[PDB]
Amino acid sequence: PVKESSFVEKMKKTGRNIIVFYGSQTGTAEEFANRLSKDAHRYGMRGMSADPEEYDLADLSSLPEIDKSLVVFCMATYGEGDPTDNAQDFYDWLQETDVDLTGVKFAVFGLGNKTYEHFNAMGKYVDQRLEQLGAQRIFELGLGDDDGNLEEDFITWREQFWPAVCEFFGVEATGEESSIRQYELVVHEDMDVAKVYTGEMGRLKSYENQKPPFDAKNPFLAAVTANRKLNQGTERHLMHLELDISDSKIRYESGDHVAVYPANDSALVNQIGEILGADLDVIMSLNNLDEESNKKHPFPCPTTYRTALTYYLDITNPPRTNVLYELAQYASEPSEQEHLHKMASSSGEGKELYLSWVVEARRHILAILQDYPSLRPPIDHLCELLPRLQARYYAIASSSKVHPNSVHICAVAVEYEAKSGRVNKGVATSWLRAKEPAGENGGRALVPMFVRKSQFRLPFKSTTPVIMVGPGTGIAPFMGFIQERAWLREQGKEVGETLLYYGCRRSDEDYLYREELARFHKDGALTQLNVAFSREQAHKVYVQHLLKRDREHLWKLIHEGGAHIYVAGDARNMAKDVQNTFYDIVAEFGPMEHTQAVDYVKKLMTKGRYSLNVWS
Numbered sequence: 083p084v085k086e087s088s089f090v091e092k093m094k095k096t097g098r099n100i101i102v103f104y105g106s107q108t109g110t111a112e113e114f115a116n117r118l119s120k121d122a123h124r125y126g127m128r129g130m131s132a133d134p135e136e137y138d139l140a141d142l143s144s145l146p147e148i149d150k151s152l153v154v155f156c157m158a159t160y161g162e163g164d165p166t167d168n169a170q171d172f173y174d175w176l177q178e179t180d181v182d183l184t185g186v187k188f189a190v191f192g193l194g195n196k197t198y199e200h201f202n203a204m205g206k207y208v209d210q211r212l213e214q215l216g217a218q219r220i221f222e223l224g225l226g227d228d229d230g231n232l233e234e235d236f237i238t239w240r241e242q243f244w245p246a247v248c249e250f251f252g253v254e255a256t257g258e259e260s261s262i263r264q265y266e267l268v269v270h271e272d273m274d275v276a277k278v279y280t281g282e283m284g285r286l287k288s289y290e291n292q293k294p295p296f297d298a299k300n301p302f303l304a305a306v307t308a309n310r311k312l313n314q315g316t317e318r319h320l321m322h323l324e325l326d327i328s329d330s331k332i333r334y335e336s337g338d339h340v341a342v343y344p345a346n347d348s349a350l351v352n353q354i355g356e357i358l359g360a361d362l363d364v365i366m367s368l369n370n371l372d373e374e375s376n377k378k379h380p381f382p383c384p385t386t387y388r389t390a391l392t393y394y395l396d397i398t399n400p401p402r403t404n405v406l407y408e409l410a411q412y413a414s415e416p417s418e419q420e421h422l423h424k425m426a427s428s429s430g431e432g433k434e435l436y437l438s439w440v441v442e443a444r445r446h447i448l449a450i451l452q453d454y455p456s457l458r459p460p461i462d463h464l465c466e467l468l469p470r471l472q473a474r475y476y477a478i479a480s481s482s483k484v485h486p487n488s489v490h491i492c493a494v495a496v497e498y499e500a501k502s503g504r505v506n507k508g509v510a511t512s513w514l515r516a517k518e519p520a521g522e523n524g525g526r527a528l529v530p531m532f533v534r535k536s537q538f539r540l541p542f543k544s545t546t547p548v549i550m551v552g553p554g555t556g557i558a559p560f561m562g563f564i565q566e567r568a569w570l571r572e573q574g575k576e577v578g579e580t581l582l583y584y585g586c587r588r589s590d591e592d593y594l595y596r597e598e599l600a601r602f603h604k605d606g607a608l609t610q611l612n613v614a615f616s617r618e619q620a621h622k623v624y625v626q627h628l629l630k631r632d633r634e635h636l637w638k639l640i641h642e643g644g645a646h647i648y649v650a651g652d653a654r655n656m657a658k659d660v661q662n663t664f665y666d667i668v669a670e671f672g673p674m675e676h677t678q679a680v681d682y683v684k685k686l687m688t689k690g691r692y693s694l695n696v697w698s
């Protein structure tokens with residue numbers, strides 16, 4: 083990327099004394115950064131949030147040139163305790179630099195967690211490194227946990243952070259409070275249709291005029307060739323889709339991920355407009371009131387409210403506390419204005435109400451507008467407050483050795499009864515489920531997508547043994563692994579053992595790729611096809627039980643055969659239980675104490691022989 087000029091100079095030229103950097107992948111850290119940046123005004127200060135990737139952090143050395151200057155880092159962790167893609171350069175710089183940061187004042191809030199090994203790795207590193215470099219910490223490191231409730235961890239940290247800042251710099255709670263807007267509304271009663279965004283992510287008309295290379299800013303509209311129901315029963319809906327990436331020049335390997343940009347439910351969009359009495363077809367733009375910022379709009383503009391609510395805004399996840407806080411002013415019934423205002427509390431009934439009535443109940447914006455009927459905010463402000471609609475990732479279920487021009491997806495459609503009382507539908511899966519191949523040329527079901535390279539890969543040597551554990555939709559990446567493994571064999575190569583440990587409720591309910599797997603097994607592509615049917619008997623039978631059963635042979639492949647272990651699917655419980663079972667296997671056949679088995683297994687991970695492709 084081409085770097086922006088010195089952030090320190092921008093701050094000087096714009097009267098800013100605090101800058102907040104975000105290492106964000108799915109926007110969580112980015113949003114916290116903006117919240118902190120906006121907070122500054124309430125304390126006699128002025129800040130800006132910034133993407134570290136667009137700057138050279140070596141300029142931190144010049145920050146002391148600004149009086150009462152301070153830098154805050156909101157850093158989330160990804161991969162294997164890595165830094166977010168956008169924080170890679172900063173991370174590389176921190177280890178390599180020897181620059182002296184004497185005079186620099188900092189604070190760090192990490193978006194870390196517990197269902198992962200190095201929980202909050204990045205956050206801890208930045209906070210530690212800046213100090214080593216000579217900078218002085220102005221407030222304790224924050225350790226947020228997305229497994230419980232990050233929002234609340236942030237609220238807690240934030241509540242103590244500002245007072246600490248005011249006391250150190252000797253500033254007053256000046257601003258106190260008062261509704262402030264980041265963007266101004268400009269309605270376009272004309273506008274040449276050719277310059278109105280209709281859902282594209284980057285360059286205007288980029289969805290209609292496709293031009294490579296394609297990525298997150300320029301997605302490729304892949305035609306949906308196939309979309310079929312995978313499960314045999316009716317309990318749920320599991321689907322297999324095939325996206326045509328021919329002529330896109332996109333490359334991929336088994337184990338990578340495919341991201342898609344979905345469209346919200348039209349009915350839901352319609353109702354929001356209706357309940358607010360807003361005309362959704364109004365063409366408009368929301369322009370930053372700060373003419374100096376590079377963030378000219380909250381989303382592609384000009385555009386209609388309908389398009390924004392459909393392709394650019396998140397209207398289904400529970401609104402964050404600051405959003406409800408800003409909306410409170412539009413609730414005409416006192417008790418309702420009060421509940422909304424108190425959602426941002428660090429303790430008490432207001433906090434409990436938020437955790438239960440909003441988060442736990444999974445109340446999206448429309449639900450709140452319906453249940454607190456006096457809340458009728460203007461459409462333009464709400465659009466400024468809502469977070470951006472994020473792309474959804476899927477473990478590519480095919481091998482490029484076999485399907486170089488097609489990317490496959492295996493997904494379960496999300497649809498559940500929320501405690502809010504309504505049925506919530508998953509944005510991307512509901513949208514993907516409705517995509518229909520059409521028929522030859524009559525209608526073209528297109529899916530905006532791009533590929534994100536992962537580190538989940540089959541061994542370089544075809545002879546290395548492979549142990550795959552992926553129950554449920556965790557089978558997704560392994561279909562690619564297996565197609566490729568079978569391919570290698572077909573190509574005359576010597577392939578080591580390939581074992582699949584799969585699981586589903588019942589063979590006649592949701593045994594995904596039943597036919598394909600049976601075929602691969604029959605042809606020898608799969609050395610063993612171990613399937614745990616969890617509900618075909620009174621007790622549970624899970625993949626870990628099969629692993630325990632085969633402990634002796636697996637240990638042989640692991641300790642003597644240099645086998646590679648892969649775990650995909652549920653990251654919350656399955657992955658951990660599977661990990662624990664491997665601990666026990668190693669502990670028995672080592673032999674060695676549990677503590678040592680853990681180390682042994684954690685080493686396999688570091689040496690690239692124990693990989694994960696899990697999610698929640």
Ligand SMILES: Cc1cc2nc3c(=O)[nH]c(=O)nc-3n(C[C@H](O)[C@H](O)[C@H](O)COP(=O)(O)OP(=O)(O)OC[C@H]3O[C@@H](n4cnc5c(N)ncnc54)[C@H](O)[C@@H]3O)c2cc1C
Nearest residue numbers: 474475476477492493494496498508509510511555558697
């Ligand atoms: C690297 C990676 C790979 C992935 N690979 C796959 C894959 O191969 N296949 C696949 O199916 N998915 C996969 N996912 C999950 C995928 O990205 C989507 O999250 C999933 O398909 C649902 O998206 P959605 O937009 O339909 O749902 P959304 O509208 O985004 O809603 C999902 C949210 O709803 C909530 N939720 C769901 N069920 C309930 C319930 N019963 N009660 C309360 N809350 C609930 C949760 O908070 C969840 O976060 C992957 C994720 C990552 C990060």
Ligand SMILES: NC(=O)c1ccc[n+]([C@@H]2O[C@H](COP(=O)([O-])OP(=O)(O)OC[C@H]3O[C@@H](n4cnc5c(N)ncnc54)[C@H](OP(=O)(O)O)[C@@H]3O)[C@@H](O)[C@H]2O)c1
Nearest residue numbers: 494553554555556585586587616624652655656659697698
């Ligand atoms: N937030 C929520 O409330 C919520 C609720 C449901 C699902 N989800 C999400 O939706 C996804 C469901 O994916 P899926 O359809 O592919 O999986 P799935 O069908 O639910 O499960 C696959 C197989 O794994 C078994 N299993 C359950 N717990 C296990 C454990 N601890 N260890 C080993 N095996 C276990 C299941 O048996 P049994 O089911 O009989 O135990 C089943 O046979 C998950 O990634 C999850 O994050 C979220």
Ligand SMILES: Cc1cc2nc3c(=O)[nH]c(=O)nc-3n(C[C@H](O)[C@H](O)[C@H](O)COP(=O)(O)O)c2cc1C
Nearest residue numbers: 106107108109110111158163193194195198201202
């Ligand atoms: C694919 C994936 C990998 C993750 N890996 C880690 C990890 O190694 N350590 C950790 O503490 N959290 C991990 N998390 C959780 C994030 O750190 C946490 O959800 C954070 O709030 C995300 O912030 P963001 O939206 O700003 O990127 C992971 C989340 C996803 C989706």
